[PDB]
From a paper:
Major histocompatibility complex class I (MHC I)3 molecules present a diverse array of antigenic peptides, the so-called immunopeptidome, to circulating cytotoxic T lymphocytes. Here, endoplasmic reticulum aminopeptidase 1 (ERAP1) and ERAP2 trim peptides to the optimal length for stable MHC I binding in the final editing step of the antigen processing pathway.
A hydrogen bond between the S(P1) hydroxyl group and the side chain carboxylate group of Glu63 is detected in WT-, W167A-, and K66A-SCT, but not in the E63A-SCT variant. Despite the loss of hydrogen bonds, there was little variation in the peptide conformation and the interacting residues of the peptide-binding groove varied very little; the only obvious differences being in the orientation of the side chains of Lys66 and N(P4) in the E63A-SCT. Unlike 25-D1.16, the B3Z T cell receptor was sensitive to mutations in the A-pocket, as all three variants were recognized less well compared with WT-SCT when transfected into HeLa E1KO, despite their equivalent expression at the cell surface. The least affected variant was E63A-SCT, so we examined the ability of this variant to stimulate B3Z when ERAP1 was expressed. The peptide in both E63A- and K66A-SCT displayed low RMSDCα values (<1.0 Å), whereas SL8 in W167A-SCT deviated more from the initial position, with RMSDCα of ∼2.0 Å. In particular, E63A-SCT exhibited the lowest free energy profile, followed by W167A-SCT, both of which displayed the lowest energy barriers at the midpoints of the dissociation path.
Residue numbers in the entry: 1 to 13, 24 to 122, 143 to 418
Write the structure that this text describes.
Amino acid sequence: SIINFEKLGCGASIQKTPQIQVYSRHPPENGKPNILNCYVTQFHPPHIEIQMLKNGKKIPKVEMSDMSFSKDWSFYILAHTEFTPTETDTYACRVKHASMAEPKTVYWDRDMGPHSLRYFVTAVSRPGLGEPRYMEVGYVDDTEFVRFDSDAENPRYEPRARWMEQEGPEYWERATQKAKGNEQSFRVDLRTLLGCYNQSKGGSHTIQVISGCEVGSDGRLLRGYQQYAYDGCDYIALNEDLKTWTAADMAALITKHKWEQAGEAERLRAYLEGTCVEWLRRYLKNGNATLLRTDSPKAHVTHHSRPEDKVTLRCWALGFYPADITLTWQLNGEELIQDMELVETRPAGDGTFQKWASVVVPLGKEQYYTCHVYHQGLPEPLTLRWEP
């Protein structure tokens, strides 16, 4: 259950480039249906235009994940489409974002204990286009379980995991009413934050909040979260002592002084140490059978030719959950660094993740190199080599 936010009341009166990965959900095989993914990360503002193209022309029906953001405040989204790869068909993903002068096109290259209840809140103004879009997203251990989107005719809190369907009508009635009330606070804050930052009146701006609690195995609060951001940059945040605030620039000092007089830090300490802890307990019970799952990575090495007498050994890790993983290449019992390339861990689209690490080795010396895969679901790290 999310907290009821207090208005920032700041007073009276920078863009990030997306990063793109284009890859198939499964290893591509000509003639075998698959899924083409376009994974876009690290961008801000959140408005983004994504097209998937086959042989230059726009693919008609592409699906999009709902947009989320990470702890660095940047946004990410997964676009995917169904496709059957061939040897000559060319696929690409084109992303149009304000941070770039020109749309970016990235082509598909076949070689490409503690628990937590946290709420990710977004309020984006779109002056002229309508009212600000407001969203509340709840996570039980990185797993989304509830969602509120004001961009509907009759916006309501919705279960996002089947185990949340047990909550009676009274739970969803009050959660939605809190969201609509919370939406109003961010509507007012968006308006006044304009003059506090000396910004023109016609642009789009965002407020982001991360609110929640991390609870150890003993049921005690490990860490409480209450962090605000305006336009993708730190604004104010409750400190680890849960008693004082860290304001990130001059505008946030009015909010900090106002919240000290109002005793807001103590209101949140009561929410985090209490209400947040007890609700996470109720949520964990309903989702016990599904939330604690771990999927071990399955690994394999592929072999790719290079100029002159070099080859590329690419070590794949597929179908693993959670996302955290480590891939290393070794020669003579020592770990390699210099000639080794990575990709950021990326979703497959089915709940599991993928990653690979490659290394350039001399031709004929492939059996001198061993890849190592470290994952929490593996009883012992995987070791494997290129096998023709």
